[PDB]
Amino acid sequence: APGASIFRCRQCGQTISRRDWLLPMGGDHEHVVFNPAGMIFRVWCFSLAQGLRLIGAPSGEFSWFKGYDWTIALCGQCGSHLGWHYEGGSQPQTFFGLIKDRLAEGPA
Numbered sequence: 001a002p003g004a005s006i007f008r009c010r011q012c013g014q015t016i017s018r019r020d021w022l023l024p025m026g027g028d029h030e031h032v033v034f035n036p037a038g039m040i041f042r043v044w045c046f047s048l049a050q051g052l053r054l055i056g057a058p059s060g061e062f063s064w065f066k067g068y069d070w071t072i073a074l075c076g077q078c079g080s081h082l083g084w085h086y087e088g089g090s091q092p093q094t095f096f097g098l099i100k101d102r103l104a105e106g107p108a
């Protein structure tokens with residue numbers, strides 16, 4: 001009976017990811033970053049996620065991860081901005097960077 005297995009959208013409960021799917025990019029699953037508007041994000045990298053809606057086409061502009069282009073990832077249910085999908089890179093080609101305080105962790 002693990003209580004810390006699944007990540008859900010904090011705003012609505014949509015199923016998003018799993019602790020088992022955390023990915024240590026450059027040796028750490030956690031990356032703390034700022035956007036050009038100075039907003040700080042505590043980003044957890046995941047190999048896999050579900051329940052999102054990826055908006056638009058990828059952009060390399062101000063990518064926090066060398067070699068990757070990003071797309072905005074909304075909660076597919078409620079539209080909350082949960083993070084970004086990264087693509088176009090190498091080892092791995094793709095991953096998700098999700099904003100940890102916009103998720104809730106809980107049982108399977």
Ligand SMILES: O=C1CC[C@H](Sc2ccccc2)C(=O)N1
Pocket residue numbers: 034035036061062063064065070084
């Ligand atoms: O890797 C990323 C994801 C998107 C954000 S936000 C951004 C806003 C305007 C232009 C370019 C990026 C960022 O800075 N870096």
Ligand SMILES: [Zn+2]
Pocket residue numbers: 009010011012013014075076077078079080
């Ligand atoms: Zn949601």
